[PDB]
Swiss-Prot record, chain A:
Part of the 50S ribosomal subunit. It comes from the Archaea. The keyword Disulfide bond does not apply. This is Large ribosomal subunit protein eL21. Keywords: Ribonucleoprotein, Ribosomal protein. Residues 1-24 are annotated as: Disordered. Residues 1-23 have a biased composition (Basic residues). The keyword Nucleus does not apply. NCBIfam families: PRK04306.1. GO terms for cellular component: ribonucleoprotein complex; ribosome. Belongs to the eukaryotic ribosomal protein eL21 family. PANTHER family: 60S RIBOSOMAL PROTEIN L21.
From Swiss-Prot, chain B:
GO terms for biological process: translation. Part of the 50S ribosomal subunit; contacts the 5S rRNA and probably tRNA. Forms a bridge to the 30S subunit in the 70S ribosome. This is one of the proteins that bind and probably mediate the attachment of the 5S RNA into the large ribosomal subunit, where it forms part of the central protuberance. In the 70S ribosome it contacts protein S13 of the 30S subunit (bridge B1b), connecting the 2 subunits; this bridge is implicated in subunit movement. May contact the P site tRNA; the 5S rRNA and some of its associated proteins might help stabilize positioning of ribosome-bound tRNAs. InterPro entries: Ribosomal_uL5, Ribosomal_uL5_arc, Ribosomal_uL5_C, Ribosomal_uL5_dom_sf, Ribosomal_uL5_N. Belongs to the universal ribosomal protein uL5 family. The lineage of its organism: Archaea, Methanobacteriati, Methanobacteriota, Thermococci, Thermococcales. The gene is rpl5. One of its GO terms (cellular component) is ribonucleoprotein complex. It holds the Pfam family Ribosomal_L5. It comes from the Archaea. This is Large ribosomal subunit protein uL5. One of its GO terms (molecular function) is tRNA binding. Keywords: Ribonucleoprotein, Ribosomal protein, RNA-binding, rRNA-binding, tRNA-binding.
UniProtKB/Swiss-Prot annotation, chain C:
This is Large ribosomal subunit protein uL18. Part of the 50S ribosomal subunit. Contacts the 5S and 23S rRNAs. The gene is rpl18. The keyword Metal-binding does not apply. GO terms for molecular function: 5S rRNA binding; structural constituent of ribosome. It comes from Pyrococcus furiosus (strain ATCC 43587 / DSM 3638 / JCM 8422 / Vc1).
UniProtKB/Swiss-Prot annotation, chain D:
GO terms for molecular function: structural constituent of ribosome. One of its GO terms (cellular component) is ribosome. The lineage of its organism: Archaea, Methanobacteriati, Methanobacteriota, Thermococci, Thermococcales. The keyword Ribonucleoprotein applies. This is Large ribosomal subunit protein uL16. The gene is rpl10e.
Length: 96, 184, 196, 167
RNA sequence: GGUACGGCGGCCAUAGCGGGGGGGCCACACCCGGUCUCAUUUCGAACCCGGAAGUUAAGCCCCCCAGCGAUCCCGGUUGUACUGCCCUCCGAGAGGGGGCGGGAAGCCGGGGACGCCGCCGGCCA
RNA sequence: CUCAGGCGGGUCAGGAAUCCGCCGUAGAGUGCAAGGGCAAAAGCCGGCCUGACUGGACCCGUAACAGAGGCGGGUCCAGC
């Protein structure tokens, strides 16, 4: 039986959280900032349901191309085409 | 009964003034069991006996066997603290003979009993509104610094050394007022 | 702890000092926060800014400054003392240069007419503007200290032992509970003269 | 019942979750310990399989009955301890026959899935009845669908098969 | 610059839980009383207001431990289990094997671990 | 403000009515399947309210890569 893709389709372990990590995260990730042209990983935080990108892109590295409101604009390369995402910084991580 | 540690624990109470506990609250419950005019009668009874307002304790879950429905006001209760609580406890404990079962004490030196008919400065004014007379009375003790676990800010847990025990509670009751029995 | 699935809260939450849910909302603004805290005998007012390594406090004021540097002879845990400390911290912040801040009463309840809001009124009067609504401040007479003087007069009219127990430290320090409003006006005058 | 060669091998995924397997049958073997489990017996004869296998509950029960009767007859209730170390968890299903249409099978039995060099059963006994223990192990091995061997261990647990048999 | 002082924080158990000893310059507490501010679906219990008669018994602060929990290093099991690429290598089959490249989990033994950092003030100086 | 469940105590009251202590990492609840997330809360109890609104922009998913009418969702500007 074919099943169409939904937001939380086959994310039982991907969006799960460690038992010792329960609760809200530390505020550093919430309050972090990035600059245009920076490269950032996408690590979704399950406990924060706003500004969440599609779990399809969880674990990918993108480029910051601006910031509207509180969310950052991340440009990513899916296959060969370009996709723009709006992600809250809590879901993002700097690339060292 | 007989407490073997009375002497050295007396040395302890006298040596450490802050180790002396006190009755923080006496709770009196009237389990009326039904939401009728008897409930109001018990409410007014405890109002004129204690002097403060009652509380309508509702029923959790529904049980047809006892003729109760969830959320129905069934029983009432009142909490007494301070010197007025001391006086009320004295008169209530005098109501019945000044004897307490030695086994009724909890693990943390908390004791309580029940009275199946008003007898404490009772007043024969029961025909107008009475009939549900009967009261579960439990007393709680505490060494002074137990508000650490009650205050919201910087709440902490008291160690095992600083909390009461059954023997200390019964000896405190004996020393202050009243006597124990061997309950058989 | 019980096992591997036991979640130990943050250190500050375990100690019951910081409300992280409110911390996040306060820090979202990005402006400096005027942190106000109170003890059994003293008040603390500070101006703090965020720093991921650890938040940095720029201007801080303690109520011992009132007793030593400027001269105070009253209990440092009352609404008038809170107002004086708020005025002092506002003047200090304006001297520092910062012009705006947001109040931070920690995990104290927001009950109107309290010491924290007395500090807020003192700061806004000093000049450091903080968003607020005037209805939360304590009464002007309360800030001037009329309540303590009234209680002292009532106690003196009543049995004097109650008055002695209540204010056994003021008399030895050398201050009568009466004329406290005059003492407050004197301290206010010296503060304004020094800072203006 | 179908031939045991159908279920002999372990190529299929494990099928154990009774919360989701509907109509799964109940065990036909309910006794796993016989004799004197508290007794102190010097030697322990264990039967090992030489390859991954699945042993049906029917084979387990047949071996249990044969070995228990033999040991009871030739040793005595209190002079041995016979144990079956493996419980049947795998569920064996068969196609309900339509033909090959909607062919998912329905539960028909259950079996125990065993890995290489794993122990199936153990007989603890003293030096007097070691030959009886060995014969019982051989009789049990005669009832299983794979190749099996037997080993003799002391109370420490080190193999002494060759030395004990030679002596 | 000293301090068995506090406030705001970072990593968020190698930091926790549970125990033993010691302390109160200042400071933090317990503690005393509810006229006023504030509140009890009753209760000054909590929250709030007014203080210092008393106590370091508790919180708090300093030093110690390996009982539970967590987690770091070393040795054994062990290059074991598992696995990527090639194969005219062995097997009736299942499945194994050679060369090159990776490499556990759990358990056993010995150490570690009763937190480490940032900013600013109080008291002394 | 903190739950389920449990231990000890208490007149009627019993396994189960209402109450007093201790333990309690969620073993409760969150309208409804399952999964994920939630402890000074997203749960329980209350106060006020109707942003379940108007005019628009851009972006992701159904439909990876790789085309789409209709639809769902996300990030925002302005008005009230």
């Amino acid at each position: 039986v074919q099943k169409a893709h939904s937001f939380r389709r086959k994310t039982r372990k991907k969006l799960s959280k460690h038992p010792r990590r329960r609760g809200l995260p530390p505020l550093t990730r919430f309050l972090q900032e990035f600059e245009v042209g920076q490269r950032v990983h996408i690590v979704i935080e399950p406990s924060y349901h706003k500004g969440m990108p599609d779990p399809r892109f969880h674990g990918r590295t993108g480029t910051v191309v601006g910031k509207r409101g509180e969310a950052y604009i991340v440009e990513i390369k899916d296959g060969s085409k370009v996709k723009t995402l709006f992600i809250h910084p809590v879901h993002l991580r700097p690339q060292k | 009964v007989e407490i073997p540690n009375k002497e050295q624990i007396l040395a302890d109470w006298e040596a450490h003034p802050m180790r002396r506990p006190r009755i923080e609250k006496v709770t009196i419950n009237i389990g009326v069991g039904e939401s009728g005019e008897r409930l109001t009668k018990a409410e007014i009874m405890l109002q004129q006996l204690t002097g403060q307002k009652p509380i309508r304790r509702k029923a959790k879950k529904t049980n047809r066997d006892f003729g109760i429905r969830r959320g129905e006001p069934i029983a009432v209760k009142v909490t007494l603290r301070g010197p007025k609580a001391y006086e009320l406890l004295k008169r209530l404990l005098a109501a019945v003979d000044n004897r307490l079962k030695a086994s009724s004490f909890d693990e943390h030196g908390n004791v309580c009993f029940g009275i199946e008919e008003h007898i404490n400065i009772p007043g024969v004014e029961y025909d107008p509104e009475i009939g549900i007379f009967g009261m579960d009375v439990c007393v709680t003790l505490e060494r002074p610094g137990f508000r650490v676990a009650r205050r919201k800010r910087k709440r902490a847990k008291i160690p095992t050394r600083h909390k009461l025990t059954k023997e200390e509670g019964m000896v405190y009751m004996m020393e202050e007022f009243g006597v124990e029995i061997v309950e058989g | 702890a019980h096992g591997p699935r036991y979640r130990v809260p943050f250190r500050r939450r375990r100690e019951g000092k910081t409300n992280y849910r409110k911390r996040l909302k306060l820090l979202k603004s990005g402006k400096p926060r005027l942190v106000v805290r109170k003890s059994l005998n003293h008040h603390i007012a500070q101006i703090i800014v965020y720093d991921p390594k650890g938040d940095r406090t720029l201007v801080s004021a303690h109520t011992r400054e009132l007793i030593r540097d400027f001269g105070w002879k009253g209990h440092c845990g009352n609404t008038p003392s809170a107002y004086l400390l708020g005025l002092l911290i506002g003047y200090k912040a304006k001297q520092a240069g910062i012009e705006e801040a947001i109040l931070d009463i920690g995990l104290h309840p927001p009950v109107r007419g309290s010491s924290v809001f007395a500090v807020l009124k003192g700061a806004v009067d000093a000049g450091l503007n903080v968003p607020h609504s005037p209805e939360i401040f304590p009464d002007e007479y309360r800030i001037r200290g009329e309540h303590i003087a009234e209680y002292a007069k009532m106690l003196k009219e009543q049995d004097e032992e109650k008055f002695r127990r209540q204010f056994g430290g003021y008399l030895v320090k050398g201050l009568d509970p009466e004329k406290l409003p005059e003492h407050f006006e004197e301290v206010k005058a010296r503060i304004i003269e020094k800072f203006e | 019942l179908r031939p045991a060669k159908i279920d002999r091998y372990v190529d299929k995924p494990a099928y154990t979750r009774r919360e989701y397997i509907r109509g799964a049958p109940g065990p036909k073997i309910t006794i796993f310990d016989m004799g004197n489990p508290a007794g102190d017996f010097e030697f322990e004869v264990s039967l090992h399989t030489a390859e991954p296998v699945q042993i049906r509950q029917n084979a387990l029960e047949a071996a249990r009955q044969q070995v228990n009767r033999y040991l009871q007859k030739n040793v005595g209730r209190s002079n041995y301890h016979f144990k079956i170390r493996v419980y049947p968890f795998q569920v064996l299903r068969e196609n309900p026959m339509n033909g090959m249409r909607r062919p998912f099978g329905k539960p028909i039995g259950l079996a125990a899935r065993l890995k290489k060099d794993q122990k199936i059963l153990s007989i603890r006994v003293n030096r007097q009845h070691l030959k009886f223990a060995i014969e019982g192990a051989r009789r049990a091995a005669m009832k299983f669908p794979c190749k099996c061997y037997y080993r003799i261990y002391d109370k420490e647990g080190n193999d002494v098969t060759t030395k004990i048999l030679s002596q």
